[PDB]
Amino acid sequence: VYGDRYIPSRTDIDFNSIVSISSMVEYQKERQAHETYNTLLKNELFGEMLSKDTVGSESSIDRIKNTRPEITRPSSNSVRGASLLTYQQRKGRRLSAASLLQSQFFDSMSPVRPDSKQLLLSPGKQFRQIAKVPYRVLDAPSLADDFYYSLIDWSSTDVLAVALGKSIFLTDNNTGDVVHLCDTENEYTSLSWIGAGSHLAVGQANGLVEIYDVMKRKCIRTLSGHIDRVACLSWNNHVLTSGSRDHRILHRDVRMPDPFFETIESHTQEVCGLKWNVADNKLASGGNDNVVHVYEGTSKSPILTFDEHKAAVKAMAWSPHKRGVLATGGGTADRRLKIWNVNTSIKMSDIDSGSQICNMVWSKNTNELVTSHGYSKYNLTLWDCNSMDPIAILKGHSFRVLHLTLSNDGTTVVSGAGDETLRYWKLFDSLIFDAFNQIR
């Protein structure tokens, strides 16, 4: 019942038949559709040799997949594949048993082989990344397009504050309309909110930081300290942080009636990007000096310094997910996206982005980053910090992109550019309670 080694039996499959058998975004879907059709075709058309071969369990589809030249359980582990001659196969059949008549019965309704039917009934993986053209665009005429500007900003109440020209407009996602807050003589450069959307901290083009109320639509107060234009704003629940072109790093304690709390002038050139660390008392700073500084709290001493930039850099901020990870953008001649670690002095990544970087947005439940660009390609670049590989690139802006932000659910992202467009994409998606549920 077992064939001899020195005198193997010949299968019906011929020399060139194995040469045939072994031969191999919507594009991926079509390619997957073509491959299963080809595999099914060569499985069904062949297999008479494979049916005569094999010893137990396994399948003809497994034999074809094993030929070298959500997953269900593989039956057996044999990877013999196609072969001209077989040794083990001596013609033998199992006696008919109730399982066999059950099997031949479910086969009676099948016009194709059971193995091919199982392959087709098996579910293909529905694993794709959709980063396509925006599904919604609203109106925002006359948007500022200056390199030292950062205007749009997310709030938890589905509320966006935009500095359109010389007036502050309010866009509500829940309503889809535009509401005007106020206007002044000098143009705005930076926007921010304090608390839970109660106050709106806005920086002007002369450093005249005036806080304007949201619900009451009034100017709360009028501050000074900068002799040049503000560039960006940040805060951690009690103190606003302001950076400006005149090297001013101003922390404003909104508790006392005079918010101005401390000032820092530790940089060598103008300050353009400044995002406070909300979780820990640290600060990330930089600008056009090709120098990125990390401070502890409000002290002027730079705890960390990294100088790998080469041109005007605007994009630098902390990543909410992993602590101490600071992502820094590129320049006009630098174009290097650089990811840094605080408290360890470790360079995580440094990769050419293909264009100057101005703003960054981090996801909420995944390690996906989107970065703005300007003066080089007027586009947006997606990033994965875990594997260092771009996924998709977003373009289509008449003027450079500078302003970006993340939604509450981490799905919607907003872009700010001089093209008067707001492009919205969609990239993503205990016994105390035991006592509560006793009364119903």
Partner: peptide, 6 residues
């Protein structure tokens, strides 16, 4: 407004 022209 959508309907962005080339």
């Amino acid at each position: 407004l959508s309907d962005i022209t080339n």
